[PDB]
Design an enzyme around this catalytic site. Structure first.
Site, short mmCIF file in Angstrom:
data_model
loop_
_atom_site.label_atom_id
_atom_site.label_comp_id
_atom_site.label_asym_id
_atom_site.label_seq_id
_atom_site.Cartn_x
_atom_site.Cartn_y
_atom_site.Cartn_z
N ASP A 51 0.92 -1.41 0.15
CA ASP A 51 -0.05 0.17 0.11
C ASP A 51 0.88 1.12 0.00
O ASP A 51 1.70 1.40 0.96
CB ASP A 51 -1.00 -0.10 1.27
CG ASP A 51 -2.25 1.01 0.98
OD1 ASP A 51 -2.19 2.07 0.51
OD2 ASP A 51 -3.40 0.33 1.12
N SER A 102 -7.11 4.49 -1.45
CA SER A 102 -6.80 3.06 -1.49
C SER A 102 -8.23 2.40 -1.78
O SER A 102 -8.14 0.93 -2.05
CB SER A 102 -6.06 2.52 -0.09
OG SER A 102 -5.17 3.60 -0.21
N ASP A 153 -10.34 -2.51 6.42
CA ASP A 153 -9.75 -1.65 5.83
C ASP A 153 -9.92 -1.78 4.06
O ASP A 153 -10.06 -2.87 3.73
CB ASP A 153 -8.20 -1.40 6.04
CG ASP A 153 -7.51 -0.02 5.75
OD1 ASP A 153 -8.24 0.96 5.83
OD2 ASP A 153 -6.25 0.03 5.48
N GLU A 322 -1.44 -8.40 1.31
CA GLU A 322 -1.24 -6.97 1.51
C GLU A 322 -0.28 -6.59 2.68
O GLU A 322 -0.50 -6.71 3.76
CB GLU A 322 -2.55 -6.17 1.55
CG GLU A 322 -2.03 -4.94 2.27
CD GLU A 322 -3.14 -3.75 2.50
OE1 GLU A 322 -3.84 -3.43 3.38
OE2 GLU A 322 -2.98 -2.83 1.48
MG LIG Z 1 -4.16 -0.99 2.55
ZN LIG Z 2 -3.52 3.04 -0.47
ZN LIG Z 3 -2.85 6.26 2.33
#
Ligand SMILES: [Mg+2]
Ligand SMILES: [Zn+2]
Ligand SMILES: [Zn+2]
Ligand SMILES: [Mg+2]
Ligand SMILES: [Zn+2]
Ligand SMILES: [Zn+2]
Lengths: 449, 449
Positions: A51, A102, A153, A322
Site C-alpha cells: 500500500d 486506497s 480497511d 497486502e
Molecule cells: Mg491497504
Molecule cells: Zn493506499
Molecule cells: Zn494512504
C-alpha cells in the site's frame, strides 16, 4: 526444456567505484526474457500489494536495507516489469480524479470498473460489481485475503465488500454512513458483515475490535460479529501458535485470524521526520519494534500458511497478500516505519516466489495501489516540510522528505508506478497499463468466467 | 515473419466510467512481447533523454496533454520497460550519494563508470574514460549529439568532454575552475574546446554565447571558438531554414547548429507554482510561447534532420537526443514549462520510432538521467511548498506540487525511474538495472569494441 526463471541476482556486481562494477546484469537478457513468456493458464494467482509503495518507496527501502547497489530478493526479483495508471473518477462528473485513495484503486483491480474515491465494490452509480475473489469462489478455486491492516480497511475489504463508503466498517458506522447498505434498512450490510458472508477460505489480519459489535438486523442480530463468525462455522485464530495448528481451511472450516485490535504491529521504530530534521538533528538508524512479537505471525508467516492451506485445493487458488502499513507510515512521515514495512513485504514476496517457482503454474504479481509522498533528497537539503537523515547500509546517509501536506497526513500522489509479475501471462503487465487491466489479466490467466 | 511492433495504442479503450472501459489492453500480450525480442546486432542507436523525466513527470504531462486515460504516441509506445537506479558517488569516500546531478549521471550511461556529482567523463580519481560517442567514432559509425540546452551543459557535454567540473564551459571558467584541464596549463581544455576536438558528425543545440570566447593557448589561440569552428572545417547553422539546406554532415563537413545564446526557447508559457496556489489562485491553462519561432527548429525537427544526415553513413550511427528544459522548468516550479517540454520530447521520440520502425535494426531508448521534484496531489491540498492547479485535457483540474526546497530551486530526487526501449537488444532494460548498464547495453548492441 521451458522453465521460467526468477532474476536471481541484480545486485551491483562488484566495486561500485570501478568500471562496470556497478552493473546489475552479467550478460544479454534476451533469452532469459524469451524464457519467461507463457500464455498457458495460471493455475493459481498470488497478488502482493505494497500500500503506497511507489518507486520512491521501493528505492528508499533498498538504499537503507540493501545498499544502493543492493537487490531485494523478493520485490526486485520479478522479471517482467511495467508501469500502470491508477486515476479515480469524480463521482459527480465521471471525469478523472488524478489522485486515488486506497478504496477506489482496490475496487479497480478487483472488479475491472473504475470508481469514486472511498467506494468499495460499487461504481459511480453505486451499483455493485463482482470482485475477482467472488468469481474465484463461484468457479471453485480456493481464496485467500491476507493483510497487516484491519480486515475492514479498503485494500482487503474491497475483495469481499460493496458499500458506498469505506468508513462503513461495521453495524453502527454503516447505519449512519451507508444507510442503503444498512441491514436493518434491508441492505447487504456493513463491511465486516459482508466479509462474514463472503466466506473466503483463508482470511488473516488485524481489526478484531470491530468484530465486537452486534447485528441490528438479520438472523444473528443482537449477537456480536465475533459470535456469528464461529456460529457460522468459522474457525477463529488470535495468535501464531494457533495459526499453525490449523491444518484445514475450507468452506466448512474457513479460517479467520484476527491478530490485533486495529492494525497489526509495524516492524521498525524510529522518530518522525521533522522540519529541517536532516540539519538540526543527527542521523537516525532504525530499531526493531520490541512489541511486534513471538505471538504475532509476520506477514511472511501468514503468506506461507495461506499458500499451504490454499494449496490442498486441487482446482487452484486466489490469494491477495497486502503489506499494509507502508502507506500508513509514509503519511505518518516516519522513514523507519515506512522502510521496515517494505522489507517486511520483501519476505512475503519471497515466500510467494519460492512456491510459484516450484509449482509452475502460478502468476505472482507485486505492485501498489497508488504512489505516495516520500522523496529521496540530497543531504544538504533545506525543505518546506518534514525531513530526516538516515544511516543506510552503505554507511552513508540518506535524506527522506515529505512535503505535500501541511496537515497531519502526508498525501498520496498520482504518478504511475511499478507493476511486476512472474509466471503464466506475466507479459500483460509489461509496458503502460491501467489498474483495471490487472483485473482482466487475472480473470483470463485463471480462465475465470 | 519476425517484425517487431510498437505499442500502437494503450489508450483507455472506452468509457472510463463503465466496466473495463478504462482498460488499456485489448487482448493477451504474450505473443506481441515474444515478437519484440531480438539479439541481433543493433545497426544504429537513438538515445532519447528526458532530463528529470521520472514517472511523475511522465504521468503529469499525460494527464494535462492527453487526458488520464490518454496515451503518448512516442513516450508510452516503447514495448519493453524497466526501472533503473542512478545513484552517484561521493568523491571523497567512494560511498553512494543517492541523488545524482545531471553530470555524474550522464557520465555513467556514456562511459560505464560511476562518478562524483559535477564530474564529466572522469571517475572519482579524475581519470578520463572513453565515452560511447568516442567509441562509435573510433569504430567508424556516424554520431550525433542533439539537445535543447546549451551544448556545454552536462547532458550533451558528457558525450565529448572530460573535465573535473561541469562548470568549465569555456576558456575562462575552466582556467579558474578546472586548472588541471586548462589549455594553457597543458590540459585538454574547456568543455566547448573539447567538443570542437571530438568532432561528432552532427551537433545541434543552443549555447552559442560560449563560442564567442577565445583560446588562451594552442593553435587557434587568440581567436574565438566560433572562428576556430569554421576554420576547423565545421559548417555552422544558426536557424531552421539553413539547418535544412544541409545535405551533408561528416568528418570533413561536420555540422554545428547553435540555435540560441543559452538554452533554446520553451514550448509553453504559464506562471510559477506558488504557496497555496491551488487554493488562492484560479486554475491555469498553458499557452504556447510566441517566442519559440518559425526560425527555431523544434526538437522533433532537429532529430529528423539528424537521423536523415546520419542515415547516409552505411556503417550505422549513434545519436543522443535530449529534451533539456523539463528538468530546468521543474526546478523552476513551472508546471506549464515542464509539461510542454515533455510533449515536445514525445514528438522527438515519435520521429525516432518512425525511422527505427522501418529501418529495422535500430534500438530506440527513452529514459531520464534522474527523478525530479514534481508531484501530482489532490485539488484540495494544503502544502508547505509551491503548488498550482491546471485545467487538464479531461476538463478537470490537476494540482502540481514542488515541496522539497525552500531555496530558489526545486531539487532533483532519487527514486529509480522508467527506462524503455524498442529493437534489437531492448530486452536488456526490462527489470531492475543500473544506469551504467545502459552503456554496456549500447556497447554490445552496436558491437562496439
Ligand atoms: Mg491497504
Ligand atoms: Zn493506499
Ligand atoms: Zn494512504
Ligand atoms: Mg540535461
Ligand atoms: Zn538532470
Ligand atoms: Zn536538474
Amino acid at each position: 526444456t521451458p522453465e521460467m526463471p526468477v532474476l536471481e541476482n541484480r545486485a551491483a556486481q562488484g566495486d561500485i567505484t570501478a568500471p562496470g562494477g556497478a552493473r546489475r546484469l552479467t550478460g544479454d537478457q534476451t533469452a532469459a526474457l524469451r524464457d519467461s513468456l507463457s500464455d498457458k493458464p495460471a493455475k493459481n494467482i498470488i497478488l502482493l500489494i505494497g500500500d503506497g509503495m511507489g518507486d520512491s518507496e521501493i528505492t528508499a527501502a533498498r538504499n537503507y536495507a540493501e545498499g544502493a547497489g543492493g537487490f531485494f530478493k523478493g520485490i526486485d526479483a520479478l522479471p517482467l516489469t511495467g508501469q500502470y495508471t491508477h486515476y479515480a473518477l469524480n463521482k459527480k462528473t465521471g471525469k478523472p480524479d488524478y489522485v486515488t485513495d486506497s478504496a477506489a484503486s482496490a475496487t479497480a483491480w478487483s472488479t475491472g470498473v473504475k470508481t469514486y474515491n472511498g467506494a468499495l465494490g460499487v461504481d459511480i452509480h453505486e451499483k455493485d460489481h463482482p470482485t475477482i475473489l467472488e468469481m474465484a469462489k463461484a468457479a471453485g478455486l480456493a481464496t485467500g485475503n491476507v493483510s497487516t491492516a484491519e480486515l475492514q480497511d479498503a485494500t482487503p475489504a474491497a475483495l469481499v465488500a460493496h458499500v458506498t463508503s469505506r468508513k462503513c466498517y461495521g453495524p453502527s458506522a454503516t447505519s449512519e454512513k451507508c444507510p442503503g447498505n444498512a441491514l436493518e434498512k434491508g441492505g447487504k450490510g456493513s463491511i465486516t458483515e459482508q466479509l462474514l458472508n463472503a466466506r473466503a477460505d483463508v482470511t488473516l489480519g488485524g481489526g478484531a475490535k470491530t468484530f465486537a459489535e452486534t447485528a441490528t438486523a438479520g438472523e444473528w442480530q443482537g449477537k456480536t460479529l465475533r459470535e456469528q463468525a464461529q456460529a457460522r462455522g468459522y474457525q477463529l485464530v488470535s495468535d501464531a501458535a494457533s495459526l499453525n495448528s490449523v491444518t484445514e481451511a475450507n468452506q466448512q472450516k474457513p479460517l479467520l485470524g484476527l491478530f490485533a485490535d486495529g492494525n497489526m504491529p509495524v516492524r521498525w521504530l524510529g522518530p518522525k521526520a521533522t522540519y529541517h530534521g536532516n540539519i538540526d538533528k543527527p542521523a537516525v538508524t532504525c530499531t526493531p519494534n520490541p512489541q511486534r512479537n513471538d505471538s504475532v505471525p509476520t506477514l511472511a508467516q501468514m503468506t506461507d500458511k495461506a499458500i499451504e492451506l490454499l494449496s490442498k485445493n486441487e482446482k487452484g487458488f486466489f490469494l491477495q497478500v497486502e503489506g499494509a502499513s507502508i502507506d500508513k507510515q509514509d503519511q505518518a512521515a516516519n522513514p523507519c516505519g515506512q522502510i521496515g514495512e517494505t522489507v517486511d513485504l520483501d519476505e512475503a514476496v519471497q515466500r510467494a516466489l519460492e512456491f510459484a517457482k516450484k509449482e509452475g503454474n502460478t502468476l505472482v504479481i507485486v505492485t501498489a495501489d497508488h504512489a505516495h509522498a516520500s522523496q529521496i533528497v540530497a543531504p544538504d537539503t533545506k525543505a518546506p516540510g518534514l525531513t530526516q537523515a538516515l544511516n543506510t547500509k552503505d554507511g552513508a546517509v540518506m535524506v527522506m522528505s515529505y512535503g505535500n501536506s501541511e496537515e497531519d497526513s502526508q498525501e498520496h500522489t498520482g504518478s504511475q508506478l511499478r507493476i511486476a509479475a512472474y509466471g503464466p501471462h506475466a507479459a500483460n503487465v509489461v509496458g503502460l497499463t491501467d489498474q483495471t487491466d490487472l483485473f482482466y489479466t487475472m480473470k483470463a490467466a485463471l480462465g475465470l468466467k
